[PDB]
Amino acid sequence: NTYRIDRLNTSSVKGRTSGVALEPTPVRNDKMLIVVDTVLYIRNPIDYQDDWTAP
Amino acid sequence: EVYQNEVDTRFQYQAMFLGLSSQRSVADRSNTYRIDRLNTSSVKGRTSGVALEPTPVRNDKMLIVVDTVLYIRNPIDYQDDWTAPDFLTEMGQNNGSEFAEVFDQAHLIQLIKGRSWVAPAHLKPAFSDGIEIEATIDSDVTTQAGMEANAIAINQAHKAGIDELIKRKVPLNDMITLVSTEIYSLLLEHPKLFNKDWGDANANGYKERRAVLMNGIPVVECTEFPDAGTHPLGSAYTVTADDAKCRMVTFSKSRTLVTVEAKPFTSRIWDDEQNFANVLDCYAMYQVGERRPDTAAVVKFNEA
Amino acid sequence: NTYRIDRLNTSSVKGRTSGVALEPTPVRNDKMLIVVDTVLYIRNPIDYQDDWTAP
């Protein structure tokens, strides 16, 4: 129950290739780590005599 | 394949920690492993008429992520014949030795850094801090009186560490102490030699100098101790000046170290037309985790 | 009767990063050419009377 996602998904893919020699730019993005731990819930007690399945 | 076999088999002959740690693997594709730090296992008694209370969850399990891949780069030109024998085999041995040395180096750095663990709340009843036993050994001493003065100090530090670690309910049957070459030389006679049973079961490839049995436990001489300020695997392994002085560690062979192998050692060959070479590289991803830091004892020597 | 051998036979392990790339700087290891220029021999003047096939 863990997810890893990049901090920055923006990437300027618009790169002019007209020049013979390209000029790559070294860019790095932090890899986020998000983990789920809590079980969010809501509870509803229904008595025996009462009917819950009724629409 | 022949190169892959040569690098792999070198681990079984020089890598000490292949049998001194829990060799776990990351089954999930997330390249992350969860270590369960058990801290709520108390025993209680239902004396019939008493009413019990629910037991809350108090396990602060930790996460270890394999965020670094270790690789070796060997550019080979077309004129040179990489597939020719007596070259791949010699390549495999050196690569395996370097990889296993880095493996052991990373493990020792992990134990050294795990010396000032804080052991926060929700773990205090079943977890303790690190071990900071100090010693004052003067290596630059040629007199016989000073030579024995260092040995008694080292033995006293080892005794204190063993007593503290036993007090924390750790069996003596599973203990190994690792010493640096200079400390091992400074050790006293203790000629009890563990030729094939220094805590290793069914091990034949390893060949170490564990010829000493101090205080009822094997003591093995580790040549791969950290003394620099950096390490390839990760950036949190940068050994400081204070961390470099720790030259003897006592820990448990089944409750202190866990390793995760996200990717095994795979050899890759790929052409590189840009630089006119057939670059050969083998790489593997792994990370070492120090489960239960309270079961590891280290000593920081201070030369007078 | 010549051999070509490279001085540096094995580089060191570097280790990549999750997001941070590395810029390699492979130094050009000097390729050594070593040639055999001497024949090493042992000269024994065994005489006629002495038995050559004497174990």
TrEMBL record, chains A, C:
This is Putative capsid protein. The chain holds residues 57 to 111 of 331 of the full protein.
UniProtKB/TrEMBL annotation, chain B:
It comes from the Viruses. This is Putative capsid protein. The lineage of its organism: Viruses, Duplodnaviria, Heunggongvirae, Uroviricota, Caudoviricetes.
